[PDB]
Amino acid sequence: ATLKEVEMRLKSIKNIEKITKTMKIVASTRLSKAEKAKISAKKMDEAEQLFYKNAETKNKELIVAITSDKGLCGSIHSQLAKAVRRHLNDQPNADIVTIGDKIKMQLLRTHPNNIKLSINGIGKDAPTFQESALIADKLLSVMKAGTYPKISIFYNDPVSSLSFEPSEKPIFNAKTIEQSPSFGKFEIDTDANVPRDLFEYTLANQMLTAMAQGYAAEISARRNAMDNASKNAGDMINRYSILYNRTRQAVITNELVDIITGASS
């Protein structure tokens, strides 16, 4: 509680306030940019899955959980992790592919043996088809994504531009695309591979739609947290300013009292 302690503490929090405020304004920019890419991925979801609306598709399981590697975004990772565990109560033997070290973090504590594949380095830049396709590829290659009755993608959905809700959406394999009730209403060449190719194509597009949404939900949550951290730091600065001044006054008085006592004698 010395003057120099309060000074150090004060200058440290003063930087924190500045840094966090800056990050927040940065995130706001990142969100404008990621908003437009979310709309585009939502149009390639109305047009992409409109086949599945009409064809009216219905279904050991594969779960793919989508967050990122980055912290400082509130409960993005823990909230989605709870949604996955909740689904994991209803089926505890399912395989998990985690996209993002932070979700891997959560599910590695609670359900360590279920995780069979982790994806790294996704969160920094806006998600791309290349990333989705290559992940899908390795899903199909080493995870045998074709041989699964049910497939689910867990991601965060930006309900509004302020908050988010952990959503879920299922993926149906080539085996399931054929057995859809209204499947035959479209002229389809059974000679060539249309079911397999449509399953492998949707796997990549849906993941890209999840990541585009989960990314806009993470920026928004980080802009929320950075607004808070900055506001809290401001209050801390005010409390420590007040403390500084009390200590300042005391030090002047105390130093002077010593002098007075020495002069009196």
Binding site: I13, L72, G74, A225, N228, A229
Partner: protein
């Protein structure tokens, strides 16, 4: 340990360790939020907040200030009650149930009341 027994001594040390861990994190909590702790650290903070509350107690001479009947908890029951809380046996119980009661039976009691 020579005076209170190894059990008592060890419960105290763990309570103290838990409270210490929680204090140490007050910086982060206040600035960044609870979301920025590890999961091991979230649990400790949860547990410590319940220990903080469980250390509170209604005094008989305070009945006017509180409107809450005084409690006098036996040492042996204080040790057992805190031991059990450290061991994790009451992590499903909400915070307020530890606040301003006696022994662990009162925690369970209040929790059921709060469930109603």
């Amino acid at each position: 340990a020579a005076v209170v027994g190894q059990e008592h001594y060890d419960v105290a040390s763990k309570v103290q360790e838990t409270l210490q861990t929680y204090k140490s994190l007050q910086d982060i909590i206040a600035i960044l939020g609870m979301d920025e702790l590890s999961e091991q650290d979230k649990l400790t903070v949860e547990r410590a907040r319940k220990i903080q509350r469980f250390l509170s107690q209604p005094f008989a001479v305070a009945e006017v200030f509180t409107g809450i009947p005084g409690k006098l908890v036996r040492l042996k029951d204080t040790v057992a009650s805190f031991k059990a809380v450290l061991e994790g046996k009451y992590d499903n119980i909400p915070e307020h149930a530890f606040y301003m009661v006696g022994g662990i039976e009162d925690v369970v009691a209040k929790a059921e009341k709060l469930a109603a």
